[PDB]
Curated annotation (Swiss-Prot), chains A, B:
5-hydroxymethyl-dUMP binds at G7, I9, R10, G11, S78, G80, E84, S108. Transmembrane segments: none annotated. Highly expressed in heart, kidney, liver and spleen. Weakly expressed in lung and skeletal muscle. Disulfide bonds: none annotated. One of its GO terms (cellular component) is cytoplasm. This is 5-hydroxymethyl-dUMP N-hydrolase. The modification Phosphoserine is found at S8, S78, S103, S108, S118. It is found in: Cytoplasm; Nucleus. Belongs to the 2'-deoxynucleoside 5'-phosphate N-hydrolase 1 family. Induction: Up-regulated in response to c-Myc and by partial hepatectomy. HAMAP family: Nuc_phosphate_hydrolase.
Amino acid sequence: RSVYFCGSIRGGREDQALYARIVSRLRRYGKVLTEHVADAELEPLGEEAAGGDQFIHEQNLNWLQQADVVVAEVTQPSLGVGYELGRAVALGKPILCLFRPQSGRVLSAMIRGAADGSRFQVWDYAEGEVETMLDRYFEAYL
Amino acid sequence: RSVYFCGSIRGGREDQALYARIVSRLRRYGKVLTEHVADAELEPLGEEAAGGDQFIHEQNLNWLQQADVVVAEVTQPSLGVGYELGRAVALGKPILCLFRPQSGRVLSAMIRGAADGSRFQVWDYAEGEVETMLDRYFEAYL
Ligand SMILES: O=P(O)(O)OC[C@H]1O[C@@H](n2cnc3c(-c4ccc5ccccc5c4)ncnc32)[C@H](O)[C@@H]1O
Ligand SMILES: O=P(O)(O)OC[C@H]1O[C@@H](n2cnc3c(-c4ccc5ccccc5c4)ncnc32)[C@H](O)[C@@H]1O
């Protein structure tokens, strides 16, 4: 029922439209707890949220614990995304990472190297394929 | 005795000289398990290590478990650094994050928000202060 979606925010918003596409597809497979990550309206570098980073942190950890599945778009380097994956691994959550090699980047060894091909999966994709990728995973997931 | 140092690699090498300064100072407080992170010679985007990301991942997790203290320079956004901090938090390691506001960046809410001011600390510093910062922490640490 519950999906935790991770994507870069203060690591930068370059991929925001992709996060929106990902979140949209995910809604047919479950409740997306993190949907705000995909919001085009959200741009930071303000410093707001009025509850502070502490509130953000605690609220997210609560959602991460509820999550049946964790999905991360790992193309844009982000401390927050890495942290969430680290916490998720320790919680024993099934995890799907999606990476775009077409970005010219090489994915982090700690992310790529964390993959077992089962409970932690990393999929390389081309931008137009992302729905199919999500479809494969979640159909298989049953 | 044992310090795990985290710094960006595939997130980018901009701060490499700082990592070297940090690692150098840390050696008087203990064995630095991760010292290679500070190496100027290390530049990636190759894709090497010949043992693969899996080997890198497992070797680092072994070191992280041995570590008495985790120190991270969090100024440059990195998935790997975030991941290491996430794993370290779950292992209950004391943690010191160092951040430079002079970089113009705003630090990740998940990192800043993870801080309790005791077992997880985040210190803002100016580049010339980093030795003093490390000194404060480790003297206090006894
Ligand atoms: O910011 P990053 O790139 O280090 O990490 C992004 C990841 O960490 C989580 N995260 C990071 N910043 C978040 C925020 C956030 C950040 C900055 C803000 C600034 C102004 C107003 C609201 C804000 C909310 N809200 C919710 N989750 C967040 C999030 O789930 C995402 O997956
Ligand atoms: O690469 P990032 O920025 O996502 O994460 C950097 C963090 O994650 C760890 N880490 C990341 N890449 C690492 C490597 C590594 C990466 C790429 C390489 C390429 C060619 C040859 C050797 C390599 C070694 N070795 C050891 N630790 C690494 C490291 O401890 C550091 O703190």
